[PDB]
Amino acid sequence: VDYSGRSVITVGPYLRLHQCGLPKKMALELFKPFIYGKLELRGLATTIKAAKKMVEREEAVVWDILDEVIREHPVLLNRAPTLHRLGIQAFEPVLIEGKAIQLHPLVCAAYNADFDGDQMAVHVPLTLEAQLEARALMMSTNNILSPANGEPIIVPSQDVVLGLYYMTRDCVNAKGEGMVLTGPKEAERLYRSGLAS
Amino acid sequence: TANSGYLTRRLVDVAQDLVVTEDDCGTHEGIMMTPVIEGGDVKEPLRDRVLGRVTAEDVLKPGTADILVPRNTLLHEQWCDLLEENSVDAVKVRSVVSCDTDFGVCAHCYGRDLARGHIINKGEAIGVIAAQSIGEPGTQLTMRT
Amino acid sequence: KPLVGTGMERAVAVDSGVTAVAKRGGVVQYVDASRIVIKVNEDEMYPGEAGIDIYNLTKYTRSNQNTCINQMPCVSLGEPVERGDVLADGPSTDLGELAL
Amino acid sequence: TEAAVAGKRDELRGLKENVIVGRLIPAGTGYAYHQDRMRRR
Amino acid sequence: SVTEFLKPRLVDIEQVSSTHAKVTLEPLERGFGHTLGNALRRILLSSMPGCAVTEVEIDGVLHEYSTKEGVQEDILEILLNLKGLAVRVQGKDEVILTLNKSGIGPVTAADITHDGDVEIVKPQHVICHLTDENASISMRIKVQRGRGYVPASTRRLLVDACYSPVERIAYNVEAARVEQRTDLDKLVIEMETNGTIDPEEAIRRAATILAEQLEAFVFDPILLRPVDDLELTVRSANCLKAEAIHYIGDLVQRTEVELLKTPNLGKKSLTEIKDVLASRGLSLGMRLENWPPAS
Amino acid sequence: SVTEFLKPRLVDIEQVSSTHAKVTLEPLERGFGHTLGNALRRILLSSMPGCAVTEVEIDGVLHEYSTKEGVQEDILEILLNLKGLAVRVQGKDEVILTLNKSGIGPVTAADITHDGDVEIVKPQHVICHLTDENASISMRIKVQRGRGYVPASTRPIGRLLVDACYSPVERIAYNVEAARVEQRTDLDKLVIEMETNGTIDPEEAIRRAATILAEQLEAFVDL
Amino acid sequence: EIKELLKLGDLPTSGQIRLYDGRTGEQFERPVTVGYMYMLKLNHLVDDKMHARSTGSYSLVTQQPLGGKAQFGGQRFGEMEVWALEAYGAAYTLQEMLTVKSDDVNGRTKMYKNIVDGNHQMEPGMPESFNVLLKEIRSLGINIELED
Amino acid sequence: ARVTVQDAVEKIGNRFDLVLVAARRARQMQVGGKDPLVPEENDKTTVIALREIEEGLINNQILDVRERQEQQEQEAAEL
Amino acid sequence: YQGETTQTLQDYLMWQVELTPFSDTDRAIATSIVDAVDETGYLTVPLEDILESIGDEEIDIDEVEAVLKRIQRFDPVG
Amino acid sequence: NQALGKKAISKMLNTCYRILGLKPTVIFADQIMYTGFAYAARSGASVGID
Ligand SMILES: [Mg+2]
Ligand SMILES: [Zn+2]
Q: What is the DSSP letter of C92?
A: T
Distances (CA, A) of H9 to A63, A131, B21, E81, H54: 35, 16, 20, 47, 8
The rounded distance, in Å, linking the Cα atoms of D4 and D8 is 7
Helix/strand number for chain B, H first, E second: 4, 6
Q: Per the CB < 8 Å rule, is A143 touching B136?
A: no
Per-residue DSSP letters for B16-81? TT-BEEES--S----EEE--EE-SSSEEE-TTTTSTT-BBSS--S-SSSS--SS-SS-B--HHHHH
Q: Do I4 and G61 touch (CB under 8 A)?
A: no
Q: What are phi and psi of E278, to 5 degrees?
A: -75, -25
Q: Do G23 and E34 touch (CB under 8 A)?
A: yes
- Return the sign of the alpha-carbon dihedral for residues G103, D40, B20, A138: positive
Burial F101-127, CB ≥16 within 10 A → b, else e: beeeeebbbeebeeeeebebbbeebeb
G61 and I3 Cβ atoms separated by less than 8 Å: yes
Give the span between the Cα atoms of G52 and G72, in whole angstroms.
8
- Answer yes or no: are the C-beta atoms of A100 and G48 closer than 8 Å: no
CA distances (Å), C8 to each of C22, C54, G38, in order? 20, 29, 16
H41's CB contacts (< 8 A; 6+ apart) are: none
Q: For B105, phi and psi rounded to 5 degrees?
A: -115, 165
CB H48 within 8 A of CB H26: yes
C17 three-class SS: coil
Contacts of G50 (CB under 8 A, 6+ apart): A5, A6, A7, A8, A23, A25, A26, A99, A100
Architecture of the domain spanning F49-165:
Beta Complex (2.170)
In this complex, which of G62, G71, G116 lies closest to I2 when CB atoms are compared? G62
Among residues F199, F195, F170, F180, the alpha carbon closest in space to that of F23 is found at: F195
β B105-106/B20-22 pair status: parallel
Rounded to an integer, what distance in angstroms lies between the CA atom of residue I31 and that of residue I18?
A: 10
Q: Which of J17, J23, J25 to mutate to test the interface with H (most CBs of H within 10 A)?
A: J23
- A67 in a known ligand binding site: no
Q: Is J50 exposed, middle or buried (0-12, 13-18, 19+ CB in 10 A)?
A: exposed
- E70 by Cβ neighbours in 10 Å (0-12 / 13-18 / 19+) ranks as middle
Question: Positive or negative CA dihedral for F75, F81, F83, F85?
Answer: negative
CA E123 – CA F68 distance, rounded (Å): 87
* Distances from the Cα of A3 to the Cα of A77, A121, A126, F140, J21, angstroms: 12, 11, 9, 50, 36
Q: How many CB atoms lie within 10 A of CB F209?
A: 26
> Kind and range of the H or E element at F88?
strand F87-88
Residue C66 DSSP class: S
Asked if residue E107 lies in contact with residue E41, where contact means CB atoms within 8 angstroms, the answer is no
Query: What angle is formed at CA F160 by the lines to CA F157 and CA F165, rounded to 5 degrees?
Result: 155
CA nearest to G44 within chain C: C65
Cβ-based neighbour number of residue G82 at 10 Å? 20
Indicate the residue type of E42. R
- The distance from CA A49 to its chain's CA centroid, rounded to whole angstroms, is 34
Answer for the pair B138, B6: CB distance below 8 angstroms, yes or no.
no
**Alpha carbon distance C88, C28 (integer Å):** 12
Instruction: Return the CA Rg of chain F.
Output: 22
Q: Is the dihedral of CA E271, E276, E278, E284 positive or negative?
A: negative
- Give me the amino acid identity at E10: L
- The answer to whether B101 touches B83, Cβ cutoff 8 Å, is no
- G118 near H CB under 8 A: yes
Instruction: State whether I22 and E286 contact (CB < 8 Å).
Output: no
CA–CA gap between residue F101 and residue A13 (Å, rounded) = 55
User: Is beta strand E161-162 parallel, antiparallel or unpaired with respect to E149-150?
Assistant: antiparallel
Q: Under a CB-based contact definition with an 8 Å cutoff, are residues I6 and G59 in contact?
A: no
Task: Determine the distance from the C-alpha atom of residue E286 to the mean position of all C-alpha atoms in its chain, rounded to a whole number.
Answer: 44
Helix (H) or strand (E) segment spanning residue H52: helix H45-54
Instruction: Using an 8 Å CB-CB cutoff, list chain E residues near I47.
Output: none
Instruction: Output helix, strand, coil percentages for chain G, rounded to the nearest 5.
Output: 35, 5, 60
Overall size of chain G counted in residues: 148
CA distances from F38 to A87, E32, F44, F45 (A): 45, 12, 10, 10
Inter-residue contact F192 to F166 (CB < 8 Å): no
Q: What is the number of the ligand closest to the CA of A9? A: 1
How many Å apart are CA B127 and CA B19, to the nearest integer? 7
Per the CB < 8 Å rule, is A49 touching I16?
Answer: yes
Residues of B marked as binding for Zn(2+)?
25, 99, 106, 109
d(CA I58, CA I56): 6
G25 interfaces chain E, CB cutoff of 8 Å: yes
Q: Which CATH number fits domain E49-162: 2.170.120.12, 1.25.40.10, 3.40.50.300, 2.60.40.10?
A: 2.170.120.12
Question: Best residue in F35, F38, F192 to probe G by mutation, most G CBs within 10 Å?
Answer: F38
Distance from CA of A64 to the nearest CA of D (A): 35
Which DSSP string corresponds to chain D? -TTTTTT------SSSHHHHHT---SSSTTHHHHHHHHHH-
Which residues in chain A precede a discontinuity of more than 2.5 Å between C and N? none
Measured in Å, how far apart are chain D's first and last C-alpha atoms?
30
Q: For residues B124 and B20, is the Cβ–Cβ distance under 8 A? A: yes
Alpha carbon separation from A110 to A79, A94, A148, B138, E69 (Å, rounded): 10, 21, 12, 16, 61
Query: Could you say which DSSP state residue C96 is in?
Result: T
- Concatenating the DSSP letter of every residue in J1-50 gives -----SHHHHHHHHHHHHHT-SHHHHHHHHHHHHHHHHHHHHHT------
Q: Does H15 touch chain B (CB under 8 A)?
A: yes
Which secondary-structure segment (H or E) carries F142?
Answer: strand F136-147
Dist. CA I52–CA I59, nearest whole Å: 10
Report which residue type is found at G122. Answer: M
* Cα distance between residue G108 and residue G58, in whole Å: 12
Q: Does D7 touch chain G (CB under 8 A)?
A: no
Could you give phi then psi for residue I6, rounded to 5 degrees?
A: -90, 155
Whose CA is closest to G98, among G120, G71, G125, G119?
A: G125
Cα gap I69→J4, rounded to integer Å: 76
Q: 3-class SS at F25?
A: strand
**Residue C6 region by backbone torsions, left for phi larger than 0, else alpha for psi between -120 and 50, else beta:** alpha
Q: Among E289, E148, E128, E276, which residue's Cα sits nearest to residue E219?
A: E289
Q: How far apart are CA A53 and CA A58, in angstroms?
A: 8
For residue E91, report the phi and psi dihedrals to the nearest 5 degrees.
-90, -55
Of A60, J1, J46, nearest to E178 by C-alpha is A60
Distance CA C58, CA C69 (A): 7
Q: Say how far apart CA F6 and CA F186 lie, in whole Å.
A: 11
Judge whether E107 and E99 are in contact, CB under 8 Å: yes
* Alpha-carbon gap, residue H4 to E19, rounded angstroms: 31
What chains are in contact with G, requiring at least 3 Cβ pairs below 8 Å? A, B, C, D, E, F, H, I, J
Known binding residues of B: 25, 99, 106, 109
I50-59 per-residue burial string, b: 16 or more CB within 10 A, e: under 16: bbeeeeeeee
DSSP 8-state class, residue H42 = S
Q: Assess contact for F5 and F173: CB atoms under 8 A.
A: no
Whole-angstrom distance, CA of residue F78 vs CA of residue F71 = 10
Which residues share a beta bridge with E157?
Answer: E56
What gap in Å lies between CA C72 and CA C35, rounded to an integer?
A: 9
A129·D28 Cβ contact <8 A: no
A140 vs H4: CA distance, rounded Å? 9
- Rounded CA separation F71/F126 (Å): 13
3 state DSSP class of I8: coil
From chain F, the residues in CB contact with E5 under 8 A are 47, 212, 215-216
Q: Which of the 8 DSSP states describes residue F110? A: G
Please give the single-letter amino acid code of residue A93: P
Q: How many CB atoms lie within 10 A of CB F75?
A: 21
Dist CA H23 CA A126 (whole Å): 13
For residue F94, with 0-12 CB atoms within 10 Å meaning exposed, 13-18 middle and 19 or more buried, which class applies? Answer: exposed
Exposure class string for C21-35: b at 16+ Cβ within 10 A, else e:
ebebbbebebbbbbe
Cis status of the peptide bond prior to F27, with omega within 30 of 0: yes
Cα torsion for F81, F87, F92, F97, to the nearest 10°? -50
Domain that holds residue H43: 1-79
Give the residue on F whose Cα is nearest the Cα of G21: F38
Number of domains making up chain H: 1
SS (H, E, C) chain E: CCCCCCCCCCCCCEECCCCEEEEEEEEECCCHHHHHHHHHHHHHHHCCEEEEEEEEEECCCCCCCCCCCCECCCHHHHHHHHHCCCECCCCCCEEEEECCEECCCEEEHHHCCCCCCCCECCCCCEEEEECCCCCEECEEEEEEEEECEECCCCCCEECCEECCCEEEEEEEEEEECCCCCCCEEEEEEEEEECCCCCHHHHHHHHHHHHHHCCCCCCCCHHHHCCHHHCCCCHHHHHHHHHCCCCCHHHHHHCCHHHHHCCCCCCHHHHHHHHHHHHCCCCCCCCCCCCCCCCC
DSSP string, A139-190: BTTT--B-TTT--BS----SHHHHHHHHHS---TT-TT-SPPPSSHHHHHHH
Sign, CA dihedral A88-A94-A95-A96, equals negative
Q: Please choose, from the candidates G44, E157, E205, the residue with its C-alpha nearest in 3D space to the C-alpha of residue F223.
A: E205
CA distance J23 to chain G (A): 21
